[PDB]
Amino acid sequence: RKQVSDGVAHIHASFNNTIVTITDRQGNALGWATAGGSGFRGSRKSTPFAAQVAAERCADAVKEYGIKNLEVMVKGPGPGRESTIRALNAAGFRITNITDVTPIPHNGCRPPKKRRV
Amino acid sequence: IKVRENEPFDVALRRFKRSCEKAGVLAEVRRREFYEKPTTERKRAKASAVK
Amino acid sequence: RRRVIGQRKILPDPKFGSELLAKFVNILMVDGKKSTAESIVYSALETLAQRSGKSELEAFEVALENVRPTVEVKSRRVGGSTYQVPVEVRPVRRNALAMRWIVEAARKRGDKSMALRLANELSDAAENKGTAVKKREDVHRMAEANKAFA
RNA sequence: CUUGAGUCUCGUAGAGGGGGGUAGAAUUCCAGGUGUAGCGGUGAAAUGCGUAGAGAUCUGGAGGAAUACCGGUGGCGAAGGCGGCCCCCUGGACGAAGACUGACGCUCAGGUGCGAAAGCGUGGGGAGCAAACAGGAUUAGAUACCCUGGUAGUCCACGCCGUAAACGAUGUCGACUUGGAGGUUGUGCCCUUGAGGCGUGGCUUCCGGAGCUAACGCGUUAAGUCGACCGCCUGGGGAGUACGGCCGCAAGGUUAAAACUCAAAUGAAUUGACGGGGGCCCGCACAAGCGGUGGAGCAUGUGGUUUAAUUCGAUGCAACGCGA
Ligand SMILES: [Mg+2]
Ligand SMILES: [Mg+2]
Ligand SMILES: [Mg+2]
Ligand SMILES: [Mg+2]
Ligand SMILES: [Mg+2]
Ligand SMILES: [Mg+2]
Ligand SMILES: [Mg+2]
Ligand SMILES: [Mg+2]
Ligand SMILES: [Mg+2]
Known about the structure:
This is part of a larger assembly, with chains A (117 residues), B (51 residues) and C (150 residues).
Chain A: E1 6-12, E2 19-23, E3 29-34, H1 42-45, H2 48-62, E4 69-75, H3 83-90, E5 97-100
Parallel strand pairs in A: 1-4, 4-5
Antiparallel strand pairs in A: 1-2, 2-3
Helix pairs in contact in A: 2-3
Chain B: E1 2-4, H1 15-18, H2 46-49
Chain C: H1 19-28, H2 34-52, H3 56-65, E1 71-73, E2 76-77, E3 82-83, E4 86-88, H4 91-107, H5 114-126, H6 131-142
Antiparallel strand pairs in C: 1-4, 2-3
The complex binds magnesium ion (9 copies).
Chain A binds one RNA strand of 324 nucleotides through residues 8, 10, 12, 14, 16-17, 19-21, 23-24, 26-32, 34, 36-37, 42-43, 73, 103-117.
């Protein structure tokens, strides 16, 4: 509705869910879409496919924003982390620079115990 | 990691990503530390590396 | 199990010389009554041919087209998790399943005599109407919705 | 007297120690911009957080703890233990040539001091994790494992506590005893013409011979062959318990029995069996299909119930149209 012609694509590929938020280079959320919020839940929403079917739905918003091309901001493991890209890259959206913003602490915080079964 | 390609051919080149960061330095920290497991469990790798 | 069979060849349609159409008679063939059975196969087969205008084997495959499953899910118990991993079905299996469904559904179509059941239910498939075409699509829905595993 | 020990000169490497700085990565929190209906979590969930606008995303800021990569069979240390970088104060180990003192050594009950973590005191600090505790789920139950929160504590300063599978489960010092492979750092030499090659010291992994061992195994870093000194063991349970002494703020530590009771307890290795161990296979075992049972009427066998008697026997798969 403002025609930005281009922005950036954020992907929060978590181990349980994946979400894609397209925003102008400034960092202002233009349009977002999440796997879970796309029907399938639990086991199904945490699959690679889920990210794709969900991601494509994000473009269904940030596209009518004049957007032509965009970058890639991937962080965290889990599926879709790679899938999400192809969706956009193939959704006509001209790609450009793929970057892995995945955080990596040089040893600072102590992770939680948990997981013990 | 940073990656920019010239000419639209659609190639991820996800190499530079997993060629260092990604999992490992992540999957390792995904859950509670080791505290003891490193000075031992981790040092038992040679028990396999030696042969 | 670990064996390696080949293919139990069948008498190519006892009236059209078509192996494919032949087994179709075997499916409906019950209690070794290959005679009484096939007698119901051709009747509804020729009837539908006369009604559809085109030959039996024609409307046969045609109506079968809408009953041919392209893919299906399979059970795989790997670690207490019984995932229904989907996977496309080979050719011979595709048509095979179809014929089975057609008969099964026809046998309980609820008409008066099998002749009508088979024939009538055979047409419904040609235009995607009877359970035949339904099962196919219903099964395809299992997949895709499970394609995450695929 | 000089080979033991030590002193000097000169270098050698180092997460060795005390103190003070300091950088970047991330976490959480606060503020605001953008944006909208989810997020989070699991095996599923649910609690929980979201329209009072979360999550995601961007900007600024607050703070605490820990230093990815280098990094290892690595290095240092008496032991515990010790990892970013910078400086300051500081201890030890090693080689080199020699110069020097001249047996000044080794060991050591008691004694002295150092001592992981948890814990205790006072006063600070507090992001993340997390006993307790609180919900939610699981279950027959589940005061647990799992999820959502979360206090002590963890961090700091000074003091206390002295324990650990404080482990190489292997006291210290010295001397001899075939080898092979590799890491670490010092030093002598070689067209150094090279990292290349040869030697020769300290340390350290791995394999292993002789011999030792109950066997497993150890093996010039011994558990081999000897010497000097010390500590400790004398069946299992009761029991590192009681009592008393000492120590302690306390939690408790330490020294340390008896009655009674059993004929074992124990080490290693062997064979087999089993594993919600692993690898490779087979059977209509599964999957792939067709038809059945379980519902129905009746036959029939069986338990039961009854009976004067309901003759006796078969009662996981291997009993129940079975001996009949
Ligand atoms: Mg918890
Ligand atoms: Mg402490
Ligand atoms: Mg305290
Ligand atoms: Mg050492
Ligand atoms: Mg050996
Ligand atoms: Mg034993
Ligand atoms: Mg067989
Ligand atoms: Mg079966
Ligand atoms: Mg059936």
